[PDB]
Amino acid sequence: KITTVIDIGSNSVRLAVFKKTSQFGFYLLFETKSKVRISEGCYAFNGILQEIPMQRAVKALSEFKEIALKYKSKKILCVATSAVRDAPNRLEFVARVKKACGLQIKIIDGQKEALYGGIACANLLHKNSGITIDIGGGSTECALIEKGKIKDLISLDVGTIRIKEMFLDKDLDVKLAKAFIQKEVSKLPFKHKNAFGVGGTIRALSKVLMKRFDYPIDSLHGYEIDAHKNLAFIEKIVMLKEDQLRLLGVNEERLDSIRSGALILSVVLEHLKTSLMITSGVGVREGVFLSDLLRNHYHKFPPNINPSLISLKDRFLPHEKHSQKVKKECVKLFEALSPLHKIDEKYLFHLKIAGELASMGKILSVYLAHKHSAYFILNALSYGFSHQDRAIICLLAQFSHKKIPKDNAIAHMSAMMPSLLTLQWLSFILSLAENLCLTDSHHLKYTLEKNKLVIHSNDALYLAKEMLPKLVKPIPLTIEFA
Amino acid sequence: KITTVIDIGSNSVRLAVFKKTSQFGFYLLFETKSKVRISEGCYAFNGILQEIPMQRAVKALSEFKEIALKYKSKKILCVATSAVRDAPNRLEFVARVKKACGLQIKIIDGQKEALYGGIACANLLHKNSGITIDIGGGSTECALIEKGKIKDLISLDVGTIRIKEMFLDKDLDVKLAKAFIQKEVSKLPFKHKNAFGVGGTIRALSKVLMKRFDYPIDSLHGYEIDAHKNLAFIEKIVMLKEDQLRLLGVNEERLDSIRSGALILSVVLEHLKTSLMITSGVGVREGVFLSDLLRNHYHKFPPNINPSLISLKDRFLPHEKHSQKVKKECVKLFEALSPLHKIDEKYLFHLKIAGELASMGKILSVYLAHKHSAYFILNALSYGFSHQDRAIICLLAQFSHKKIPKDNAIAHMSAMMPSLLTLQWLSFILSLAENLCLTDSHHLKYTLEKNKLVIHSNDALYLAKEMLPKLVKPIPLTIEFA
């Protein structure tokens, strides 16, 4: 039911508490982080973990234990990574952690660490064809994904803290460090246009880009980045000092490692010749959980199975017999109007998911429920949806039975967004479908003419007619009940 | 578990679906409305209900049945009011409704109708000392409330549709109708400074006031109105035509009845000499439900029992063992800082409820969870809370571990709001209490010096110290762990 995953990283030791709400439904119940930096001064002593950072990891792990127990978790899986697997005292740390708190750390290998990164990306992102990039403190993992399946894995022994402690602490030439980077980046035997940015270093870089570009959506999971347009600026971050990084929105804990990790990313992108990187909020923690939940399904969700959409329903509407019919009437109502709007048939995906969650906001309050639904969509419908998908679905629910202004920030957040006339049509269909599904109606059938839309049904539909004037129309048309 | 209440009004026939989540927890699961206006042309025929409006009520009620069944409701209570109880064909309508759908309408009397209005107001409003005013289509109910107890009841046979059909349809002098109003308003044997505005007519008038005053809170339930400051404008509404009412934000369907009902309100307020009216979103529908839920408790919630707060927890956090300790540490932390802030001891109510719901937003997403909590507070914490109470609690949770800007709209929505220095202190205490309650700590004790705040505990509190720099302080002070 409730599962905890501890990621003992080189720089960041994370924790994540997952809750299983269905066969495939799950949502992140809690998360935290700690900059213990277990690998502080170890890359000069041949991976010998000093006593100062190790005792910090003991106290952090000892309190991560209380958190996992505080949330009544029935499973706890601990994993270590580069800074621990490449340690001569590796077995010494796995013993003393049980001495204090009683946690059995399972050391992961570089090939197996890159596995989880691909498991999380091949199922929780709107694209299943890319190359993961987990730039961590000690190691940089990559993995090719092809239509959900992971092909090849590689684990470069290069990281943000590693490159920092031996190159950037000595103020060596920036191209001197870029040589050691290329020493391991050139052995990447795969190339792809897409890339999946994983790790706190890449997410910190994505926050800087969202800041200057004045991005309206406040979520980083799924943020598309033009690799060719932004590669120039990414290389510059290495040359900026502490103050200049502060103005760009870099956190305090991510100052000594951001510019070292920014160099590593600029080399990988140009090597892979990527043209589109996608920020990922999921990483090793989510990969460990998905491998268990999908052990009987080959580490892949079945077709048309989205974990965010499923988990969002189980939380706020476990009885969707009402919202299920609202969707089924949108599909019929759409093709029954295709001459007038001539809308691409790909937008049914957005209109269908909208009809399922348009009434989700009622769990908070029946007044402004569609406003509450759009808030839930824009902030929770994360896994498997791009920001454009969420923006469309958000606008469809928010402006139900209303007209969309011309200066909507979320409507103009991208150049690939549909036109307002297209959005008004989808919102109109959903508005009309909600009116026809309000009562316990049954087996309706529609038909169009030039401007007349006639609805055939053996039901009275008295209420559906009374609120018909309170309906925004995309173009002049007539709605008649026969 | 799920209960439906149908209110067959003179003008508006409403429906409300309630869900019982606890012994005293309940939230409005669904609501709707229909302008059937069963009393159209009956006040000229001595209450004879015409055939045109009655057959509309048959189709509306027949579909209200499907809604109640669609939501798996185990109880359905139907009540009629003035336009039906004063009808010669009253028994004829109660029979033909069973003929079509099978609903047993229970006709309520004027004294019993005013009862439910007081039951809803004496438990779901931030003041329990007032006089209810249910200005409906046919009758205007009033009821004195004293510290939760209802003293006297009266049922004036005056309404918005009644006064319209025989006075305002003839364009008689506005003071001619004001005489028939005074004929029944003078028999009000009670007076009080407070008033509780009930009904769609009074809520429509409250929406007009919130619009011109540019009210930032978008909820009408609990909107305080200065009776002496706004009585002048209320009388004017009768003199404005259709167009001018459109600009003021009046809903089309409330156009023929708003100006007739606006006259009725101006007479009652001046008679009662009220100085503060409080808009009420709850009415007859909520009174019927509360009389059942509180049948064994004398139609009153026990002390410190809020139905909105209880129902809000059961929905989004039925396991509050974590949030219950976050509150208990706020109370101790407050008095352990009283010399430095010298804050009124009445604000514990806001700080205590904040500590219980500050982590409520995690059910939506762990990222920006405090932002999600504030959204839930400002939009759902309705029953028993004034807009000032919600605004304070909303700001405490939203700006946790952050500083509050000087131009916050919700912070400057009233002249009685506390100062930002007071709000920063409360938000600081909550931020510190959340850090001390993160782990499964136990039995802490604090103490203050001039600027030193020393926290005594037998726990390590390693994580609580790491995130101490990320803490906004109201004034320069020192936090030490001993």
Ligand SMILES: Nc1nc2c(ncn2[C@@H]2O[C@H](COP(=O)(O)OP(=O)(O)NP(=O)(O)O)[C@@H](O)[C@H]2O)c(=O)[nH]1
């Ligand atoms: N793994 C992951 N991290 C994220 C994502 N979005 C933001 N973060 C990171 O999560 C950290 C915390 O953000 P937030 O969760 O909003 O902190 P909070 O301390 O938890 N505040 P609150 O309790 O109000 O939710 C930030 O340092 C940010 O880098 C995401 O989608 N995935």
Ligand SMILES: Nc1nc2c(ncn2[C@@H]2O[C@H](COP(=O)(O)OP(=O)(O)NP(=O)(O)O)[C@@H](O)[C@H]2O)c(=O)[nH]1
């Ligand atoms: N009884 C009551 N009515 C209210 C309250 N707040 C708004 N209303 C009324 O409820 C009616 C509908 O508002 P809304 O519920 O937002 O309509 P909706 O059609 O239900 N839209 P949505 O599905 O987005 O929630 C309006 O006509 C308004 O007058 C309230 O607190 N109590």
Ligand SMILES: [Mg+2]
């Ligand atoms: Mg890692």
Ligand SMILES: [Mg+2]
């Ligand atoms: Mg509603």
Ligand SMILES: [Mg+2]
């Ligand atoms: Mg009434």
Ligand SMILES: [Mg+2]
């Ligand atoms: Mg969080």
